[PDB]
């Protein structure tokens, strides 16, 4: 019995780690490098 | 037909060889042929070479069961033998009754002193199609192997929660009529693999009105293997369980008869591995 | 503009008339008709992204016979 | 034929007394040499059967891409040629252009069928055997080289039974059983 | 496995318990052997050596 | 196939189902069926006469079933093939006896 | 600790019921996954004409080089009209005959 | 389409053919001098006669 509850439990807290780390590295990604994009767009005007 | 039956599989691994290498062509043809269906420009690799489109006149009239089963899936029925592993104690012979019980086409063949070389060449040439193999430990059976055999599959199966109807109480007769079947998630392309090898040793097309019904459930990596008999009333449809319930698991799955344990192995259980807990038909 | 059918048949119209109510539309288009009418499109969709040395080759003529080809087509 | 100057091979640069054009650059000799083919003419007598299976693969692409009657004999010549074993495989029907080719047909000969069987260690080989009277397909004993070998008939190529070949395999391996005359 | 466990109580309670060797060669002990007690049946990744140590992580 | 030799008709067709291609035959004595066998296939097909269906397909040569012969008394099939074996199949009435000669 | 796989499942009341009900609803909507038992133009006919016999020409030496060991065409029910006549005359030309029948039967006229 | 035979020389369009094609390409040329393209008029023979069939 604790076989089994403490293998699902795991398996949640790594599925529940996964999603908030690809979370944070994409809203990262996102956010942030259309803002670095868009200063390097208007940097190469001058 | 020692010769025609070895070069037919080489024959066959030959051309499925050629399928997996010359597959690209299969997609890069279905490129341009969307490219003609829809008028959007071409890729460079597929525009600068001029062989492929001087074959793709020729080729543009081209266009479930997988390859063991595809010839005569719903030609001809199946022709089973269940034996058991050797020297048997009473409890397996019991089981192995009830399973040749349960598939219909199946015979039940005593097990000593049969070489399983031997034993798997006198199947095929005398024409059966699956065999069934059951392994004990002290009464309890264990495993059951399937054998599909003009060089076909096995796939081998743990039996967990095995209770017998020999074992239960006298509640009469089974039916033996061709029954209906029941998958319940099998989801992955193991999972259809694993279906269409459990579902080819049972008569094709059942009577709409046949009234037993056997259902393999995937709970997890474990199908819940049980047998019911049905009378649909006036508000419901009352169901009554009879004949062997068990849980089976697929351990392996490889690509020759049951004598060499040389052929490729599709799938086998993973159980060691790091993440091994972690997903379902892994 | 962005008829596809309407804009093969008009620029198909010229060898479907050297090939050939008519029939214009695939699923109906017999032989050389075919085999031409398929090359014509398959040299439109890759002249876009394939190479201008690489998607128009000429068929190996000699010079003394391509000139005197060319010299009576221009004629 | 005397190695030209520089001044004669610039004013007759066409002089070939070798190799011309209607040769096809010797192919017929090229693909006899290399199946061991006795007479001359099996080049030419399986190019008419190559052109008709290419002329009807033609013929049969140019029809439109979905009509049944292109569908069903497209897949339909495509079964025959590999069942016979000209075709290795019956996937693609641009086979019944690039692959359809008088080396397939030739590699089906009862000579490269044996090599390739390890029945004999070279194509000139199985030729001298199949000549020798050694060689049956079933039952009976064949006697030409020429003897094409459909798929399901190269099971049954064995030696016959006394034969000098048979009883020395079975008594290199010291399998020789002499009740059954080998 | 000789010495981890003093009574099969005791891998009773630890059945299915990962381990490994110091080679690292992953395993999993399977059940209590029943004349000696301590003693129980691993299944390993490979064949193991007589010079190992079988370890059980616990915290 | 059968041809009746009275209205010159040929009035029943029998194939299998693999596309074989037939070598010899033997009829029942009392003829309700049919039998063929083939040199590609090591099968023997058994077709009812009455109706036109496959009635049975017996295996168990290892070998092209070369010749084909009912006895024409006690109706017992009698085949022989190039696995140097004939055989003996007890066809008629519950037996689906086999009994193999070398 | 850490434990390497999921144990195999204790099959309780609750598990059947939920499996019994799965099976209920699958049969009273009769969700079974058994097996189940296995003129045009004239430029297109006289294409099909010609590729037709070019078909049956190239299939006959095909044959007689593969020494008639083939594999035979699939399956065709066609659709063969008989007239009534004696069987007399379906015969050959030679001065005796061997049945004088009609080619319909009683059941066929 | 038209089934016609159609010179377009000068200021005017000389056209052959059966009387249902040239009512079809009078009403063409005419509507072309007029604004409207002729490849609307394409595109509704083809309607035409895949809706005729």
């Not at chain 4, 005397?2 to 209607?22: A, N, S, T």
């Not at chain 7, 598990?15 to 189940?36: A, C, H, K, P």
């Amino acid at each position: 019995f604790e076989a089994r509850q403490r293998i699902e439990e795991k398996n949640k807290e790594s599925s529940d780690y996964h999603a908030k780390m690809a979370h944070i590295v994409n809203t990262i990604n996102t956010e942030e490098g259309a803002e670095k994009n868009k200063y390097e767009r208007e940097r190469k005007l001058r | 037909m020692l010769r025609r039956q070895a070069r037919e599989r080489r024959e066959y691994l030959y051309r499925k060889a050629q399928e997996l290498q010359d597959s690209q062509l299969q997609q890069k043809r279905q490129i341009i042929k969307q490219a003609l269906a829809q008028g959007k420009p071409l890729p460079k690799e597929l525009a600068e070479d001029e062989s492929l489109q001087k074959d793709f006149r020729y080729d543009q009239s081209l266009k479930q069961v997988d390859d063991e089963y595809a010839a005569t899936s719903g030609i001809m029925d199946p022709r089973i033998i269940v034996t058991t592993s050797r020297d048997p104690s009473t409890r397996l012979s019991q089981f192995a009754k009830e399973i040749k019980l349960l598939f219909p086409n199946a015979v039940r063949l005593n097990r000593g002193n049969y070489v399983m070389p031997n034993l798997v060449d006198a199947c095929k040439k005398s024409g059966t199609t699956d065999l069934v193999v059951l392994h004990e430990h002290r009464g309890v059976p264990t495993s059951l192997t399937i054998s599909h055999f003009p060089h076909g599959p096995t796939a081998q199966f743990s039996l967990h929660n095995v209770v017998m109807r020999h074992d239960i109480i006298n509640a009469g007769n089974q039916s033996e009529v061709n029954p209906h079947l029941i998958f319940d998630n099998f989801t992955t392309a193991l999972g259809k693999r694993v279906v269409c090898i459990l579902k080819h040793l049972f008569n094709a097309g059942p009577k709409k009105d046949s009234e037993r019904v056997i259902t393999f459930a995937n709970r997890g990596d474990f199908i819940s293997v049980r047998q019911h008999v049905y009378v649909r009333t006036r508000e419901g449809v009352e169901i009554a369980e009879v004949g062997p319930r068990f849980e089976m698991r697929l351990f392996e799955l490889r690509l020759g008869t049951l004598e060499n344990k040389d052929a490729d192995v599709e799938w086998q259980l993973r159980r060691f591995i790091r993440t091994a807990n972690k997903k379902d038909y892994l | 503009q962005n008829d596809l059918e309407l804009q093969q048949f008009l620029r198909e119209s010229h060898l479907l008339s050297a090939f050939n109510g008519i029939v214009y539309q695939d699923d109906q288009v017999i032989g050389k008709a075919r085999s031409r009418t398929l090359e014509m499109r398959l040299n439109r969709l890759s002249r876009v992204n394939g190479h201008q040395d690489k998607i128009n080759k000429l068929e190996k003529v000699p010079m003394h016979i391509r000139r005197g080809m060319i010299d009576k087509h221009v004629k | 034929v005397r190695k030209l100057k520089h001044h004669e091979q610039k004013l007759l640069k066409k002089v070939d007394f070798l190799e011309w054009k209607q040769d096809q650059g010797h192919r017929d000799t090229q693909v006899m040499r290399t199946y061991h083919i006795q007479n001359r003419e099996d080049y030419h007598k399986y190019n008419r059967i190559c052109g008709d299976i290419r002329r009807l693969a033609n013929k049969l692409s140019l029809l439109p891409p979905t009509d049944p009657f292109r569908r069903k004999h497209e897949q339909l010549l495509l079964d025959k040629l590999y069942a016979m074993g000209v075709l290795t495989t019956k996937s693609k029907i641009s086979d019944l252009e690039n692959k359809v080719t008088v080396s397939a047909i030739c590699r089906r000969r009862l000579p490269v069928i044996m090599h390739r069987l390890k029945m004999a260690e070279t194509i000139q080989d199985a030729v001298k055997f199949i000549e020798q009277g050694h060689v049956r397909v079933g039952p009976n004993l064949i006697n030409d080289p020429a003897y094409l070998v459909t798929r399901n008939m190269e099971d049954y190529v064995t030696w016959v039974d006394n034969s000098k070949i048979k009883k020395t395999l079975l008594r290199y391996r010291n399998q020789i059983d002499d009740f059954d005359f080998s | 496995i000789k010495d981890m466990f003093s009574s099969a109580m005791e891998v009773a309670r630890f059945e299915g318990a990962q381990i490994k060797t110091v080679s690292g060669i992953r395993g999993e002990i399977k059940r209590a052997l029943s004349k000696p007690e301590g003693h129980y049946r691993a299944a390993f990744e490979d064949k193991i050596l007589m010079s190992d140590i079988v370890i059980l992580r616990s915290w | 196939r059968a041809w009746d030799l009275i209205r010159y008709r040929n009035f029943r067709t029998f194939t299998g189902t693999e596309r074989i291609q037939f070598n010899c035959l033997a009829v029942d004595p009392s003829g309700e069926v049919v039998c063929a066998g083939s040199l590609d296939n090591f099968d023997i097909h058994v077709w009812s006469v009455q109706t036109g269906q496959l009635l049975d397909a017996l295996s168990g040569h290892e070998g092209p079933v070369s010749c084909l012969s009912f006895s024409q008394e006690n109706s017992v099939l009698a085949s022989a093939s190039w696995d140097k074996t004939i055989r003996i199949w007890s066809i008629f009435g519950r037996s689906q006896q086999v009994e193999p000669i070398e | 600790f850490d434990r390497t796989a999921k144990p195999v499942p204790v099959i309780t009341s609750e598990v059947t019921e939920s499996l019994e009900d799965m099976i209920r609803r699958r049969i009273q909507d009769s969700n079974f996954d058994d097996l189940q038992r296995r003129a045009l133009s004239e430029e297109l006919q006289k294409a099909h004409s010609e590729i037709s016999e070019l078909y049956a020409n190239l299939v006959y030496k095909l044959d007689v080089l593969s020494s008639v060991h083939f594999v035979p065409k699939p399956a065709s029910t066609s659709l063969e009209i008989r007239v009534e006549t004696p069987t007399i005359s379906m015969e050959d030309a030679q001065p005796l005959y061997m049945s004088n029948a009609s080619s319909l039967a009683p059941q066929e006229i | 389409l038209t089934k016609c035979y159609i010179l377009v020389q000068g200021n005017t369009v000389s056209a052959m053919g059966p009387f249902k094609g040239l009512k079809e390409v009078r009403r063409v040329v005419e509507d072309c001098m007029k604004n409207i393209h002729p490849i609307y008029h394409i595109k509704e023979l083809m309607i035409k006669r895949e809706l005729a069939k």
